Structure formats: C-alpha cells, structure tokens
Here is the input.
Amino acid sequence: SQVSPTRMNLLQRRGQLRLAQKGVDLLKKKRDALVAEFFGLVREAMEARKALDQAAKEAYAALLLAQAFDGPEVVAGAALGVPPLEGVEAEVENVWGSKVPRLKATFPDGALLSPVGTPAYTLEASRAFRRYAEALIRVANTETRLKKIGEEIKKTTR
Amino acid sequence: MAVIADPETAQGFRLAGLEGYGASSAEEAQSLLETLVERGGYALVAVDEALLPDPERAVERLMRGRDLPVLLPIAGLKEAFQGHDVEGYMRELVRKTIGF
Amino acid sequence: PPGGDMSEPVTQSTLRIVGAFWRLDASLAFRRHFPAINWNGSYSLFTSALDPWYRENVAEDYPELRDAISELLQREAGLQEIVQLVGPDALQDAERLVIEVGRIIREDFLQQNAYHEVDAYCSMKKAYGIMKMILAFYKEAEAAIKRGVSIDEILQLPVLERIGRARYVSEEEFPAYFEEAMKEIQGAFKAL
Amino acid sequence: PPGGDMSEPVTQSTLRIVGAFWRLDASLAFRRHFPAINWNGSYSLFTSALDPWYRENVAEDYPELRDAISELLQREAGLQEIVQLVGPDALQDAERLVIEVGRIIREDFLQQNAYHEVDAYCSMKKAYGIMKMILAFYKEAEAAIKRGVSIDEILQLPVLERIGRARYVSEEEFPAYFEEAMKEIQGAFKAL
Amino acid sequence: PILSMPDDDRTHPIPDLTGYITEGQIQLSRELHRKGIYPPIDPLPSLSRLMNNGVGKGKTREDHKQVSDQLYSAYANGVDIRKLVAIIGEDALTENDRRYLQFADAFERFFINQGQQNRSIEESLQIAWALLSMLPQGELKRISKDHIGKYY
Amino acid sequence: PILSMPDDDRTHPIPDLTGYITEGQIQLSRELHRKGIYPPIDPLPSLSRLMNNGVGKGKTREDHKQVSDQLYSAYANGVDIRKLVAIIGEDALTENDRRYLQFADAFERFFINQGQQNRSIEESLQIAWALLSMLPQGELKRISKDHIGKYY
Amino acid sequence: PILSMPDDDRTHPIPDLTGYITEGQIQLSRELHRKGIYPPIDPLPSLSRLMNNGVGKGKTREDHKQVSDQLYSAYANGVDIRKLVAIIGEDALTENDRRYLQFADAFERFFINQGQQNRSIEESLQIAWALLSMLPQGELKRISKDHIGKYY
Here is the structure.
C-alpha cells in the first residue's frame, strides 16, 4: 500500500520494541498487584452484608407486635429525626480512566436518637436501622471498589 | 440520603436514619427512579433486586453517563445468601478479572 | 544526506573527527522548532572544558544552573517514553511536572526566532537568566504540588505566560524585565 | 550463537537437517538451574523409532511413562501462561496440583545437576523409577483432592520429598530405594 | 516541476537532492485524495525556503509573517494526538488538549476543502483567523499580543 | 578494547566482532551521563566475563565471592520501581519494595558517578556494603548470612 | 509439490514463485500439528485452481459445491473473534459471535485433525454439515435454501 521509507528507519523502528516491548514487559504484573490484594476488601464486602442482612429484619418485624400496626405513628414523631443527607465522609482515589471517589456515611444518628418516648419495640426497632446505614457503608467503598477494579483490570489487560 | 425499595420493608427507613418510601408492587419504580434523580443530592440511593436492580442501565439510561448516586441490589425476602453471593463475586469479576 | 539518512557515508565520515555533533529533523523547522535539531541526538563534549570562560563571564556557578537543567531536558525523557506508551492517562504528580516543563522549554526556551528583531542573538546574562526564569516556578512547583496544590490551577497560571515572552526581549530590557516577574512568580503560585 | 539468537543462518539452517535439538534457555539458566535445558524449545526425531526398542529391552511400559508424564508441558504450557501472575488463587484446587508436580519434576526430576557425582551418572532404568515414583504418587494425589483431601496438606508429606533425591540416589540402591519408597506412598497417602 | 515517486517515498532518489536543489517544496497526501478532501494537498514537511521573506509588510497585510508560522505548529500539536488517540481510548485525555485534536479534523477538513475557489490572498487570512478562534490567546506563542488579538 | 559504534548499533562490525572475541562487555549510556553520572556506566550491560573467578577467596576479599553477585541482582532489582513512579507514586508503593528504590539513586549518583576519584580495591568494596545497609540484615538473598552478618 | 518453506514465511520466492506456477496453494500453518492437529493442514491459503471444474454436482455430492464457501466465511471470522477475545475479555460479545466461535473449534482438531483416519468423501461431508447444525439458515447466505435443508 504505502508505509515508510527504507533506510535510516532501521535504527529508529528498532527502538520501538525497547519502548513498547519493555513498557509492557512488566506492565502486565503491574496491575496484577492491586487486583490480587483488592480481593481482600471484596471478600469482606459480604462480611457485613450477609451478617447484618439477615439481622436487618430482626427488629423490623421484631416490633410487628405492638408497633407493627402502630409503626406509621411511631414513625411520624421520630422519622428522619437526624436524616442529614450526605453528612457522609467522601473520599477521592485513583483508578484507570481518571480518579473515582468513594466514601462512607459514618455519623452519630441512627444511634438511638429519635425520641418521642415510645414503647418497647421502637428503641429495639430503631436500633435495626444500624444494620442498613452502618452496614450499607461496607459496600459504598468496597462494593464500589469492585467496579473500579473492573475498568483497570479490563482496560489494562486489553 | 433519601432512598426507597419496598413499602412494607421500607417503613423502617423513614423511622430512623433515612426515609425509604417505595412499593413492593411497583416493579417498575421507574416512576420514582427518575424523579428521585431529578435532584440526586444525597450520597448513593439504592434499591432491592426485585425491581430494577439487576439492570443498572436504569440509572445510566436516565443520568446520561454522568456520575450520579449508584444502585445497590438486595432482595427484600431473605433465605439463603450462599447462592447469589459467590455469584455476585463471579458476576463482576468474570467479564474481566476472573475468566475460565 | 540525500534521503536524509543519518548513516550516509558523509554522516559517519565526519564522525569521530568533529565533536559536538547535531541532528536535523524534518518536522522540526517545518513546525515551530528553531533551530530544528535533534534534542538528544545532539550532545556535546567540548562544553566540559568550556566552563572556565563561562564560570567567570557567566558566573562561578553557571555550569551548575546549566547542567542541572540539561538534567531534565535529557531526563525528562524518562517519562517521554512512557508517554508514547500510554499518555497523560496514568499521570501522577511528578508527571506533567517534567513533560510540560521540558515542553515550554522548547517552545519559548529552546526555539529561538533567528528571524526576529533581537532574539536572533542572546548573551550570557540573556541565556543565563532565562534558564532560571522557569527554574523558579520549578522550585515553587516542587512545593506547590507536593504540599498538595493541584497541578490543574498550576497549569493555567497567568505568570506562566510571562516566562515565555522572555525570549523576545533584548539584552537591554531583559535584565530588569525578568526580575519583575521573578517576584510575580513566588506570588502567583505559592499563593494558589 | 554468542548473541542468543533464534533465527539466523547458523541456526534455522542446522534445523534444516539434524535429528535432535537440545535448546538451552538463558533464563532457565540465569536462575542457576542445571540442567536449564529449555524443553518447550527442544526436540529429537530419533525417539520416534527408538521408542519401539524402548519398552522392548528396557520395560514394555517404559515409554508409556515418558510420553505420559510429558503432559506436564501440555497442561503446563497454557496453564502457567495466565496462571503465572495470578498463581494459587481463584484456582479450584486440582489447578495447583498440576503445576505443583511440575515443580518436583523440574526441581527434582528435570534438574540433574550434572555437576555432582550422585545424580550425575545415571542409566535409563534409574531415571525411570524416578519419573515413576512421581507418577504412582500422582494417580492417587489427584484422586485425593477430588475425593476430599486437602491441597496445601498433601504438599507437606516428607514421603514425597524422598523423591527429589531419587535422582541423587545411587543407581544400585535406587532399586532397593524404590521398593520401600514406592510402596511407602501407598501407605504414606492413606491418612485422609 | 512535478515529480511522482512510487508509493509515499520521500527519500526516493528523486526528492533527495531535488529538495536541496529546489528552494522550497510542496507535499501531497493520498489519505485525502482518496477520502474526499479535494483538492487534497498537504505540505506536512513542505515549507518552501524564502516564502517567509517576501510578504507580510507592505504589499500584503501587516499580519502574516507570524501568522504562517503560527498556523504551522499550531496545527502540528493537533493531529499529533491523532495516534495516541487511536491507542489509549476515545476521550482519554485532559480537557484542554482535547481542543487540540478537536480542531485537527477541522483545520484539515475545512482548510483543504478548497475547490475551484479562486481564494484570494485575503479570503485566506480570514479563514485562518476563523479557525484560530477555538483557543484564545494562550497557545499562540508565535505571533505577538497585538496582531494576535488584532484579527480575533 | 575500547570503541564507538556508528549510531551505537551493536549490529555493526565494530561491535559484533568484539562481542564475539572479547571476554566481557562494558558500555556507556546517554541516560547515565545526562543526569550527571560520571562515570556513566550501566549495570548488567557492562561486565568482565572472566573476572568472576579471579575474585573472592585468596584473590580479593574472601567474601567478594558472593559479594560480586549480590549487588548485581540486588541492585538491578530496584531499577524497576525506578520508572514506575508515574504509576502509583512515592508512598503509593510498599515499604519493602519502595526501599529498593532509594538505593538505586544513592547508587548511581554516588556509587557509579565517581569521577576522577581513585578508590583502592579495598576502599571500593566497602562502599557496596554501606549501600546494602538500606535493607535490614536479612533481605539480601544473594550473599550468605555468614558474610553479611559481618561486613554488612 | 511438497516442500517446506524457509523458516516458515511464504514471503520467500521458494513458495512465492510456487503460487503462480502451481495451481492453488495449500499449507499446514505449522499450527495444527505443533498443537495436535493431524492432518495439520490449514485453510488459510488452501484452495486449488482445478478444484472448481470437476466437482460439486455430478462428480460428487451436489451440495459440496454449495457448502464450499459456506464453511469458508464461517470458520474464518471464527478465529477472527478469538483474537479480540483475549483483548477485551472472553465476554464482550453477543449471539453474533458466540456462534461463529464454536465454529472455530468444531472445524479445528474436530474436523481437520483425525490422524491416519481414512475418511472418504462420503463420511467426510456427511457430517461436514453436523457442524453447521447450530448456524441457522439465516446467518448463512452462501448456499441456496434447498441444499441448506438437505442434510442439516
């Protein structure tokens, strides 16, 4: 078709392998590291998920006795008591494609703060929220980590 | 943070912490999904896997490829979490990392 | 060289005979680079014993401010290569540090419009100073980004545009000309 | 070739006609491996017609072992590949066992430090027991992790370590060393 | 004259000495004569010799001397990513240089999209100022501050 | 022997010949010298093929035996985390391997660039040790615990 | 004509000059046997100059002439796939590939290899279709709509 001259390039096109060939020589086991240890956070991902996932209903249905038919009401007075909405602590990090941010919502609130006095189930039931919020956190930076590792893994190896 | 999923199970949400407000028959939930994002001024709103939680395409078909609060799939009714657990692991990881 | 081949009889035939060899690329002068020569491909060995005259005329530490710079012009390649291996994608903080540095260094620092009013010529105090103009920013760049400053605001620094209008200045205006920006530097950087 | 070449007259020519090729790998050696003969890169057409006599005079089942164990490379060539970096990880279990054996086959059986007097000299019927001792331990080793036995456990049995030395064993005690060692497995494995 | 050399051969026996001999030169690209750009003409290396001295002050318009040189490197930086682009990804790249490539196709597509166009000395200059407008006085380190905005 | 290639091409006779009869190899790189290293002499690229036996016990410094193959595989080992800054960063790397870095820099700048200095065969061996101190006694897999547990 | 080419490139006239002179051109790509395919012949260049006149119908199975090419575009784009596979991940494709894929295996040691097996023109083609069982009559457009339902 039509590519390049003939002489003189010999030496330049030669430095190609060194550049390509070498750049990628190690670049392979390069990303391999973050993915290897990366799992350490993934396994744990379900650590809390499964753990508090089953204890989630624990209180929810637990107070379905004297609070079940009376929840709507118990909820009025202490519903979204201290629902900050992003009071959460967001973190920035670096991964192929740019730098994606993570974060965890850690703040004293679901920590037995909605008052209205109430019966017995409430306080035990409100405590349950903990396994959503608190737990739902394990995944925001770990469950998001996985996708992050997806791009790299793929783009890199591609 | 204002997220929803199921009415019957959401109730607690509105109780402490956040305020969840979804339907268990609103399989579509799209009605809300979008509206919710109209503002999207919370962290990352998620929902049960009984609605649109498998197809994240919902959030992306609406956000338009922008970085908006992401989705997190569950189930509402639990039973065995030793099934689609080792699976979600496989679901992210295979189409990349771990093939076989 | 007819084909321009650097391995032509005439190329080598002059080698080992005459030191401080230089190369002429094709897109170099056609683009905006003047003189249009090879960056690395052009080295010099006489500059070693050429320091005596320079030391006094220029300064007792001039071969120092000139050798530490060539340090980058030729070390910068360290990244140059990876650049042609990926690009600004996986850039970290020292990354565009050098890249661009050397970059401007060739657009206004190296390229000299021999067809301009005065720039056609530059004395020591001329050659010597400039080689410092950037340096400062470099110095201040080292603690700007390292402190945490994002190279991003560092990039569009208005004073940066000042460091590139130094080549066109004459030996007369130059002296005081640069010294006025040498202040605006530490000021329009350390700040941000 | 004093320049480690693969395609060159001298070479791709010889290959033109020969009979056997014993490629040595610079890396395999760079590790201090002796012999560090790289096999994926070695060959000998003789075996073909020599195989016949193999079992004829040596042992009817002799070849069937060699050609048999060779699977190492077969299930290793494309096994190491991806698994070279990743390693013992997302692997079911039998995954490792495949490269685990290669390890002994390559650190015990393969390597024959032609330097030492012990494993230096050797005759077929000697090496044969060696390769075997690793086989009769394999036909059951994989049947173990597939039936329920541990992976990173089987691998801590001193009975197998007695194999690494089988090569180092004197060609005369090898037999006697075989009687016990071999049958030692049948019972050294019965524990899970 | 006009010498043809088999395939894109710049080091052909022909262009060799001819380059030296001839003061300046012009280059043609097949890539454009087969994709559409017609007339398809591009002097990636052609930049004559004494074309730089003869226009700009007096006969022509004030601005011109620093203009040509401007357009030159100005474009170079562009297509430059034409490669790195086809390697790393599609959008992968800082938001600024994004403009560099974003205009490449422009300059080229348009500029060389000349036709039976009589294109006068002026009809030219104009276009040039119309394509340079995509990045205000910032990268334009060839022309002076006055002239630069002069036709901005 | 001591010569230069046409363009530093080992494919030429000037190099091939030698690299065929000569018992060793010792080149100089632009890189090395560019940063100021003097003498700018690479690592593995340079080496006397037959100086590996005439050293150590009896010859020069008994422990030289393993000392000679220590700094070789140990040093170059660091040359990896040397071009990988732009990847993660300085603290973005582990301590154990990151440490294998500071070595390289203190190694080329001071260890290799020795200018006109004249280090006696003994004043020269010490240095190695000194640099090796970077890694706590126990990280060097090249020399024996015996020799390092002493000179180190 | 049965003779090995230089290293393994047809670039050489050894095989090149052979192309025109000799009718057609068949090879083994040294990929089949080196792996386990016997006969280790590859379909890349295989294709004779006198195969056309004297085959297909009458001479042999009338659907041979039709399935001639069918297989061609089917297998080819088969490997094509396996190429980008390790390039993005075994998963990044659709039904448009998951089908041409298995088409590369079936044809692989499945059809080509067989050893000293004495497969006749009958046994051969008879099952030659058992490979196109997955591929629908729509995905193919090489043969008619009659022979496609003949021995599906």
